[PDB]
Amino acid sequence: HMDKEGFLNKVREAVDVVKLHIELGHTIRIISHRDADGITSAAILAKALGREGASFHISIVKQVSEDLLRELKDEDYKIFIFSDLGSGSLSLIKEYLKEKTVIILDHHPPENVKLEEKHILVNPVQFGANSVRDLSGSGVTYFFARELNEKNRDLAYIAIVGAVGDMQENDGVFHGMNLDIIEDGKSLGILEVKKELRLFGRETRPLYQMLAYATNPEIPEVTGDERKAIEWLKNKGFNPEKKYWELSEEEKKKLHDFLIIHMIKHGAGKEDIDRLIGDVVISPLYPEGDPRHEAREFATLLNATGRLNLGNLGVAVCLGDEEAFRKALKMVEDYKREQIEARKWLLQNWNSEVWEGDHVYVLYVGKSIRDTLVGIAASMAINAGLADPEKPVIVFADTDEDPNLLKGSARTTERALAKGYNLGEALRKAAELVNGEGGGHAIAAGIRIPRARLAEFRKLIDKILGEQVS
Numbered sequence: 001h002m003d004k005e006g007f008l009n010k011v012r013e014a015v016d017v018v019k020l021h022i023e024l025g026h027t028i029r030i031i032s033h034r035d036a037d038g039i040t041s042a043a044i045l046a047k048a049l050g051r052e053g054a055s056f057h058i059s060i061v062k063q064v065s066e067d068l069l070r071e072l073k074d075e076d077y078k079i080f081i082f083s084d085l086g087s088g089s090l091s092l093i094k095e096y097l098k099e100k101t102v103i104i105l106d107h108h109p110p111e112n113v114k115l116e117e118k119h120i121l122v123n124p125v126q127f128g129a130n131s132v133r134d135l136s137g138s139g140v141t142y143f144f145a146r147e148l149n150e151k152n153r154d155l156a157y158i159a160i161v162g163a164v165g166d167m168q169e170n171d172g173v174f175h176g177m178n179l180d181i182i183e184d185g186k187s188l189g190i191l192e193v194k195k196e197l198r199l200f201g202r203e204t205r206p207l208y209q210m211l212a213y214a215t216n217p218e219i220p221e222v223t224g225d226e227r228k229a230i231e232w233l234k235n236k237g238f239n240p241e242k243k244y245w246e247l248s249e250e251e252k253k254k255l256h257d258f259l260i261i262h263m264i265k266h267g268a269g270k271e272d273i274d275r276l277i278g279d280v281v282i283s284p285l286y287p288e289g290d291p292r293h294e295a296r297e298f299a300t301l302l303n304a305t306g307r308l309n310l311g312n313l314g315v316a317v318c319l320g321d322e323e324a325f326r327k328a329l330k331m332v333e334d335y336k337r338e339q340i341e342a343r344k345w346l347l348q349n350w351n352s353e354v355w356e357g358d359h360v361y362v363l364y365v366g367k368s369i370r371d372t373l374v375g376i377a378a379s380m381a382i383n384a385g386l387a388d389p390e391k392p393v394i395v396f397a398d399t400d401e402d403p404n405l406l407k408g409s410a411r412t413t414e415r416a417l418a419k420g421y422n423l424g425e426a427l428r429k430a431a432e433l434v435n436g437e438g439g440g441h442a443i444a445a446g447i448r449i450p451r452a453r454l455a456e457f458r459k460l461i462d463k464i465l466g467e468q469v470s
């Protein structure tokens with residue numbers, strides 16, 4: 001449970017100080033995250049401020065680094081808006097942006113420091129929200145836009161695209177104020193919530209690829225084998241080359257039955273079965289078979305643009321630019337190819353490269369897996385059975401822009417959270433002793449450390465994770 005009225009009041013506070021700069025004609029400096037949640041957040045801001053005639057300059061970056069801020073203070077603008085980032089760096093924000101106004105529309109757990117009055121923090125977790133379940137970066141941006149203007153309710157589907165991108169329904173259903181965003185889109189007719197297969201490929205992928213690409217959760221003896229998916233689908237009575245949206249409601253229900261019975265016969269956990277069929281958000285504003293018709297395929301299209309340093313193009317895709325959509329459509333196939341090869345490399349090199357301690361797996365891939373896929377790689381290590389569900393997994397890779405730095409993402413399960421693990425506070429406390437930058441949610445966190453201190457990090461992160469148990 002969260003205080004929705006208290007958080008809404010803090011939203012009204014940020015809206016009031018933003019209208020302060022809109023009246024004077026100030027250009028809003030928008031810094032957003034490269035993830036699909038961040039791309040949607042920048043698109044919601046661009047449309048909301050556009051309805052007010054305000055000027056804005058959007059930059060889609062990977063993280064709020066120390067190097068970003070000292071280049072950002074000497075810019076030109078008088079107000080800055082951080083969407084889907086900034087909560088784990090407001091200590092550095094009130095130092096480098098002390099002489100500027102800063103708005104932070106983020107949902108990450110924020111480090112507890114006192115903020116300057118010209119820096120308004122709008123974070124739902126300060127009002128009782130779950131960091132990975134109640135609201136995402138696009139959700140904070142949506143409520144910020146909806147308070148600035150009620151007409152911004154037509155951005156409810158774009159906000160849900162970001163929530164599915166951040167996997168805010170990973171347990172199979174939506175929670176928190178995401179349901180309030182859904183009810184806004186339902187009253188406008190731009191959004192429908194079905195109970196379908198929560199797998200990528202509802203619109204553009206054949207049914208056998210949808211089953212073979214399933215990594216969250218995995219379908220036993222079918223994930224990674226398109227041939228066995230073709231055969232299993234056929235002797236159950238389904239055309240493998242048909243699309244899931246081309247299935248009738250009778251075929252979908254029958255498909256769900258065979259899939260659940262399959263997971264049960266092969267010993268899949270109840271939690272994976274419960275999250276296989278759940279909330280799937282569609283939008284009648286788009287044709288069926290188009291990836292924008294479903295939220296997960298929309299977010300995958302947005303992640304394909306941010307993967308190639310083209311997040312601004314994905315922002316135009318959300319806004320309705322059809323030429324940017326045709327260019328974005330040519331980026332997803334290689335994005336899915338690199339995910340499959342990340343899982344291929346994972347299954348082959350796990351038992352020979354992983355560093356297993358008393359409370360963590362630490363896998364260093366070097367350059368075999370790109371730095372923006374270590375989060376997906378850490379989750380794939382858990383869903384493939386390579387790692388114990390109660391022991392977190394951290395995957396490191398060489399940073400794209402600097403070889404002397406390592407990008408790491410930590411993922412774990414809800415069962416390990418019941419034991420006392422807090423990946424966000426563990427990586428934040430570890431990064432302090434490594435000259436690095438850490439932080440994130442209790443179930444998912446990211447860290448950037450120098451490559452030289454890797455062996456020391458493995459020892460410290462295992463001790464730190466061992467302290468927060470009990």
Ligand SMILES: [Mg+2]
Pocket residue numbers: 035037038084136137166
């Ligand atoms: Mg986010």
